[PDB]
């Protein structure tokens, strides 16, 4: 939102007031309160007939400083509020001296300068990481619309770039862009987002959450070029500075604070196939697809029924179309006997044609207008109304319907929509409609997730969720929405997925081959590689099927190759997924998050890290040309075994069974011995692979159990030309390939065989030592 | 300007119509016209009650395709228009087939697809570089404000980045930003710009100029993430796609099209020093500075009198303050006798307090409102009015004041201001006020330029201009305006400089040490290095002097070192300056323009190429840490003579007498024998420096005459271990230094001598053969 | 026309600027020009991005001081103008010292204080008969209706009563009343007047003519109780102070000036 008109003027009709001088500092137990005048009040004559800001510094978690700047406290300030984890006993320090008031939590402090020269600085062990210069925060009275706002601008240093703000599809680095955090149904091709989160972080190793569920208007170097400005229609502004000092440590505190990604079941890591959207489908179509996959030896793990499992114009009523699906329970048992999990589409709206609409209207379970009548429009469904999830009985009714589907064999739900929540309404619980707009996505996905938790169990709960708001990362799988079937859209989807991980979400899918339009085979093929090297992989489309044979013969080979690969990566992948749950480290990581000290990584958005150790660069051209940057180290292609020197750019050409998939040096990686499924006994038949272990380094590999805990740890440590290997925990029939090493000097407690990838060692006796030639 | 509302919807109250079907194609001599219906009109029943778009394709210059899309032709379409160079006779091909209508100029074509699937494509040798997809152009009837607009969106590919659009201080790469081309007095720290150009270019090697002097609203991947959208309030839209296929080639064509930067006099390249702005100044302050410089052995070539050469509140009435400056002519004579050139501040407004105001109001020389009263406000000066440069008598009056100052010894003018031109007026010539807003800056600078041209002569004409518009690059030296004294503002100034060169301007200066505020010494020192390594170097301040001794002793050492240096690099520098005049290649070049194939350069904005062969990376920290990337090759420090391998990033630390200034390999560099002044006999006493000549390469060095032409061409060719050096033209008393080469097998037609940079060879009889060890 | 809202506040949407500091004095033959800033302009850094008032003191007749206070000179300003008898060579004295700028005609002067404490005073042989206190004149920008006005307030002393302003039918002494000088057909029984004249005089023996044939809006101790306020929609305000020191002698000068 534009406040200044350039450096010298202010937007017409705006009157601004800023905290410019400290008047008094009051310590209130573990909180520091600064009263600040908008002009000089050293003299009693000026101590009246003036506004006064109240700033309160507090800490909900170690290394997080809260800053609440208030003008009037008598506003209503109704909820909902974000689902923040707020501790009361965080160890803090408050120092109130002649020169400064300073509030410290862990390594992070906020410091206010007393006297003539106001300043708010955020310090990391006494060094400024950001802050607010005088007149860069305060109160805006908009005399044009009679709306009032609170604002702040936090500094950006030379070369400091900004990331996050939700799943957004514009440029990855935010500098120069306006963003409004307001959920919308806008597709993937615009500035709009389904999943807005007013949290950003920077390459300076801190983050900031702006604690407002209503629209926050961010100007990220787009008004003041060297500042992130955020403003909100409120009588107070509250935001949290979150210490790192690395992106991953910022994300660890952020997710401790607003919610840890849950750990999805291993099965969800398999391949999903969909009915597609406005195609035809009955039981026969479904089986034809499923048998067509089996006949071509293409493993398939989850099958999804889209919207037309229900009758047209009745969507959201949970009734199986009886003319398309006469025996749903029986159909579903057959699918389960073919090894599938079952997902079905739902949403939180209901069209008027449904026989159920009248029951819900009579019961008062639908969002109402202030006069008492139903809120309705004709977007999506005719006479569409919205389930009012602030009404406890409405939540129960919808939850019982979902329990009904689980009782019939459904394993999970695609929680679609949830973004176009109107504000000209009266919620049952009396909520601020401006806050509910975004928070609805959270309450919606929470209710569905809890149904799963109470039926199939927490360990079995998974969703495919379109919208989101702060905290909804506890309810994983988020998918990237309605993309087009072209390379440009594939790239924009990837930007969204990198952004979502930068905003606290650990898991992320997207429609392989694009949603809208039919991809030419080449596009579908490149996208298949990308989707299967993502945390979650789903074939889905709008108007055409997404079965590989519909594109060409080679597409079957591509799906097959990449599905097999992903199933073999599960020992590595599931462990990285445990890392998302434990630390909020997303599986798909921006290069900048994994290599924060590398200036070459700041703007990289066409490649990513899949977990700690593997760099993947999707191919975005028919001819197979691709360029990508590799950080410091000697990197090895996961299956080609070719090596590349790091800390530079590379250009290659890949056919459809290939793309840059590179494993960093000093890596010990686990591959499993089942290429048909994701969920198997990872710690048996394990094929460990050691990549370029340098003298003086140790490589560690932790094989997960099904619940994400580590069941086995293998280490390879190199001292001279001696690599000592020690294993601890439970593992059987495992092997060790010394990648690109054809000949060893000696081997203690092991036998050695050959391979294309390098010498393969089978242990016995344990101690296992290897001496290099 | 927002048109869509996400993927699916349109902003409320907007009605859109698009060209969707070719109805008819007509070749009109050397132009192609396509009539396009907004709906299916194959059948006669629909060939009525419909709008129709008229697209005209034409070429004003080889490899530039003009696209004019019109709704109603009945609009007024008043001037001014841009000073475009349009040829009638460009050779083009027009093919009108069954499938396509195609217009081709040089390697660049525009193709429209006939039949059901409309597409507008821009092809280089038949390959798609960009284009407009169906429904991505057309007319917007805004029903909220009764305004109508034409728009287009040109596609962006994967990894396609956008640059330019004028001198802007936001992130270098425009992807993600909204930009309005509307001159403003907004400082250097916001999204606003004194210098707007509706021209952008991409890393794909093409540019586009949107041929509208009024406000053009660019949404550069900010509405549709993979298109640059531009819209204009108009009944027609007109734009030119300009082929490269390199950035330098784009600029060559663009400046051929819109105007070549003039070659400034060698003397302008020296160090400028100013009175500063609201500081105190009379003849004795001035003399005190000139002598203070001379006492300290600080070369100084230009002195500038700022605003207070005139009486306060009387700004731009051209009358010397008689109490401050009792004898102007005498003072200039005294200052010029010690070799100085003199600049004085001017602008195009005048305050009411000046005796001259009443003269101008009587004569009708001042901008009027529609009712005949003067346009006036209180910004800048009380009762400020604007010189109406559409009034020929007004122009003559102002030009005559300027001739007045020239005759008295003034060499050149700082054309400040010119951006806040109001639209609620009536120009003398009846121009459209919306087009005059930006075009004013052009008319203003053109008039001043022409005075210098007509008095001191073309070769001697130079300006220091704050605002600009298309064509203004012809009236060179533009400076970056009112920046602040800190590193972030140093950085933003640099983004501004890189950007202006990407928008057609060859020469660019900024305020050394910052305009507003007083830099800490360390900032001043760093900025000096940057300043003296830019095309034009000026010490100027708002509230304090910019003499180095105002900061510290070391500051004088910094000023001396880099002033000396720059004087020595003049034989190189002035040759790079002729290139701006010849090809529109800016002297200060973004990394992507000099190295357009290197994926690591896309985003570099903290370093630059100063001419073809030297990379400079200013240091933006106190301690002197700096990181910078080097393209492929082995680079050599200009004076430290240390070498670095390229295709990677480097990290260094530099004291205040140093910064990264690296020379590419296969380079032959002319330094001069005068370190005191920039204007001298460069071809006499020249010291050539050969940097890492590779087997089978030739390094060419063209030394310029005072008029920029090549007087002497030195070439060094390596074939095996033999380097053949050949001179051609006029040069006396020159040497050649084999950088980093200590010993040599043999030498033919020259003598050798040792130095700590490498062997120094003096020619005698031409062949100069050097056989390496 | 209400400008302030009590002592402390200003009417909503009114932006006021006032002449507060002498920046420069210039004698132009027998006229004194005072350039006056609405803020402290002692430092060069403040000598720009500010309004500036131009005040001109001149004398059309012996013992009348004309005061023109002016914002923008670019406005149209068409006639008609009042049928004033203006001499070009009345004998006057102009004293421009470090402390004061004083313009004098017969026994009456206008004096502006330089430096920190602006004051505009009208003196009769160096005794103050009335004046304008700082911030009691200047320019009103009316943001509600996009109209701009100039205004003055001349002080009233203890027991000082105000008379005239044409043929009016309200209470004889004007203190407490608002008067708009605008001819109307309203009978004799209301605040309206067929015969308006923007001239008043007081029992302290001076008079004032507000030189504006458009409506002039007088707040006669009806807004600021101890001042006569007048405002006019104009980029300049011009008024004449007319010495007595008796009512008869004021009328003598006033009718010499405006017609016998």
UniProtKB/Swiss-Prot annotation, chains A, B:
**What Gene Ontology molecular function terms does this protein carry?**
alpha-D-xyloside xylohydrolase; carbohydrate binding; identical protein binding; xyloglucan 1,6-alpha-xylosidase activity
Q: Does the keyword Hydrolase apply?
A: yes
**Could you tell me which PANTHER family the record lists for this protein?**
GLYCOSIDASE FAMILY 31 (PTHR43053), MYOGENESIS-REGULATING GLYCOSIDASE (PTHR43053:SF4)
User: What is this enzyme's EC?
Assistant: 3.2.1.177
Q: What family is this protein classified in? A: Belongs to the glycosyl hydrolase 31 family.
Q: Tell me, what does this protein do in biology? A: Can catalyze the transfer of alpha-xylosyl residue from alpha-xyloside to xylose, glucose, mannose, fructose, maltose, isomaltose, nigerose, kojibiose, sucrose and trehalose.
User: Could you tell me which InterPro entries the record lists for this protein?
Assistant: Alpha-glycosidase_related, Gal_mutarotase_sf_dom, Glyco_hydro_31_C, Glyco_hydro_31_N_dom, Glyco_hydro_31_TIM, Glyco_hydro_b, Glycoside_hydrolase_SF
User: Tell me, what is an example of a GO biological process annotation in this record?
Assistant: carbohydrate metabolic process
This protein's species is Escherichia coli (strain K12)
What are the coiled-coil residue ranges?
none
Outline the subunit composition.
Homohexamer.
Q: Hydrolase: is it a keyword of this entry? A: yes
Reaction(s) this enzyme catalyzes, per UniProt? Hydrolysis of terminal, non-reducing alpha-D-xylose residues with release of alpha-D-xylose
Gene that this polypeptide is encoded by = yicI
| Entry keyword set | Glycosidase, Hydrolase
Which EC class is the enzyme in?
A: hydrolase
Active site, per annotation = 416, 419, 482
- What is any Pfam family matched here? Glyco_hydro_31_3rd
In what way does activity depend on pH? Optimum pH is 7.0.
Name the UniProt record assigns to this protein: Alpha-xylosidase
């Amino acid at each position: 939102m534009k406040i200044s008109d350039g450096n010298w003027l202010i937007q017409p009709g705006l009157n601004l007031i800023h905290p410019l001088q400290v008047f008094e500092v009051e310590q209130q137990d573990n909180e520091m309160v600064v009263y600040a005048a908008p002009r000089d009040v050293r003299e009693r004559t000026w101590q009246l007939d003036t506004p006064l800001f109240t700033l309160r510094f507090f800490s909900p978690q170690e290394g997080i400083v809260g800053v609440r700047i208030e003008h009037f406290q008598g506003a209503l300030n109704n909820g909902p509020h974000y689902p923040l984890n707020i501790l009361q006993d965080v160890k803090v320090t408050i120092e109130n001296t002649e020169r400064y008031a300073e509030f410290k939590s862990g390594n992070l402090s906020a410091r206010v300068s007393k006297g003539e020269f106001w300043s708010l600085d955020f310090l990391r062990n006494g060094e400024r990481i950001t802050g607010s210069q005088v007149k860069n925060n305060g109160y805006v009275q908009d005399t044009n619309n009679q709306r009032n706002y609170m604002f702040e601008r936090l500094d950006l240093g030379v070369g400091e770039t900004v990331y996050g703000l939700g799943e957004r599809f514009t440029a990855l680095v935010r500098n120069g862009q306006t963003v409004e955090t307001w959920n919308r149904d806008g597709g993937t091709s615009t500035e709009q987002a389904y999943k807005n989160i007013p949290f950003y972080m920077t390459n300076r190793g801190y983050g900031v959450l702006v604690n407002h569920p209503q629209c926050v208007s961010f100007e990220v170097g787009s008004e003041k070029v060297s500042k992130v400005q955020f403003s909100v229609e409120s009588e107070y502004l509250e935001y949290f500075v979150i210490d790192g000092p690395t992106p991953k440590a910022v994300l660890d505190r952020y997710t401790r604070f607003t919610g840890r990604p849950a750990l999805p079941p291993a099965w969800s890591f398999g391949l999903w196939l969909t009915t597609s959207f406005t195609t035809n489908y009955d039981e026969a179509t479904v089986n034809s697809f499923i048998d067509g996959m089996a006949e071509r030896n293409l493993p398939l793990h989850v099958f999804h029924f889209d919207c037309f499992w229900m009758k047209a114009f009745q969507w959201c009523d949970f009734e199986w179309d009886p003319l398309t699906f006469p025996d749903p329970e029986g159909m579903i048992r057959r699918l389960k006997a073919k090894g599938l999990k079952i997902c079905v589409w739902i949403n939180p709206y209901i069209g008027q044609k449904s026989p159920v609409f009248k029951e819900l209207q009579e019961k008062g379970y639908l969002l109402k207008r202030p006069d008492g009548s139903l809120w309705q429009w004709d977007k999506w469904q005719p006479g569409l109304a919205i389930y009012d999830f602030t009404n406890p009985d409405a939540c129960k009714w919808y939850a019982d319907k979902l329990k009904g589907l689980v009782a019939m064999g459904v394993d999970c739900f695609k929680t679609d929509f949830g973004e176009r929540i109107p504000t000209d309404v009266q919620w049952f619980d009396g909520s601020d409609p401006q806050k509910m707009h975004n928070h609805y996505a959270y309450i919606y996905n929470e209710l569905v997730w809890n149904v799963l938790k109470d039926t199939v169990g927490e360990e079995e709960a998974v969703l495919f969720a379109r919208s989101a708001s702060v905290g909804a990362q506890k309810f994983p799988v988020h998918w990237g929405g309605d993309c087009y079937a072209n390379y440009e859209s594939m790239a924009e989807s990837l930007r969204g997925g990198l952004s979502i991980g930068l905003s606290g979400f650990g898991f992320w899918s997207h429609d392989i081959g694009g949603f809208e339009n039919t991809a030419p085979a080449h596009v579908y093929k490149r996208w298949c590689a990308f989707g299967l090297l993502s945390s979650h992989s789903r074939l889905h489309g709008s108007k055409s099927y997404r079965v590989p044979w519909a594109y060409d013969d080679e597409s079957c080979d591509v799906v097959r190759f990449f599905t097999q690969l992903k199933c073999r990566m599960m020992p590595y992948l599931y462990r990285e997924a445990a890392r998302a749950n434990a630390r909020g480290t997303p599986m798909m990581r921006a290069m900048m998050m994994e290599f924060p000290d590398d200036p070459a990584c700041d703007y990289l958005d066409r490649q990513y890290m899949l977990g700690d150790n593997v760099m993947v660069a999707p191919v975005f051209t028919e001819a197979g040309d691709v360029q990508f940057y590799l950080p410091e180290g000697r990197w090895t292609h996961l299956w080609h075994n070719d090596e590349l020197d790091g800390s530079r750019w590379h250009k290659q050409q890949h056919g459809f069974l290939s793309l840059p998939v590179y494993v960093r040096d000093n890596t010990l990686l686990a591959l499993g011995n089942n290429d048909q499924r994701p969920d198997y006994v990872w710690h048996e038949g394990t094929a460990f692979h050691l990549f370029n272990l340098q003298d003086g380094h140790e490589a560690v590999c932790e094989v997960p159990a099904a619940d994400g805990s580590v069941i086995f740890t293998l280490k390879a440590a190199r001292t001279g030309n001696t690599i000592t290997v020690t294993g601890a925990g439970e593992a059987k029939n495992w092997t060790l390939c010394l990648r690109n090493v054809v000949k060893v000097n000696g081997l203690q407690d092991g036998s050695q065989a050959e391979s294309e990838q390098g010498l393969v060692v089978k242990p016995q006796g344990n101690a296992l030592t290897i001496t290099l030639h």
